């Protein structure tokens, strides 16, 4: 393999979701289930719109993205 380049990655920074080892709690949510290491977080667009985008945990942790707050985890760190 290696020629099949159709993969799901961060639509914000382009990097792939290479870290999804974190068990969350109190979610029990399902937006067509969860993606492999990818959390679609509902963010706000500067054009005045709300969009679900696939964001990598790296970007989620760095929090340097245009966000509408889509993280309700009860643990700080």
* Closest alpha carbon to 35 in 55, 6, 49: 55
Q: How many CB atoms lie within 10 A of CB 72?
A: 9
**What is 12-56 written as a DSSP string?**
TT------------S----SSS-BTTEEEEEEEETTTEEEEEEEE
* Closest alpha carbon to 73 in 33, 41, 27, 40: 27
| Rg value, the chain, Cα | 13
């Amino acid at each position: 393999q290696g020629h099949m380049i159709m993969a799901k990655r961060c639509e914000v920074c382009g990097k792939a979701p290479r870290s999804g080892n974190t068990v969350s709690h109190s979610d029990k949510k399902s937006e067509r289930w969860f993606r492999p290491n990818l959390q679609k977080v509902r963010v706000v667009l500067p054009d005045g719109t709300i969009k679900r985008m696939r964001v990598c945990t790296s970007c989620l942790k760095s929090g340097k993205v245009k966000k509408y707050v889509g993280q309700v985890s009860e643990v700080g760190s």
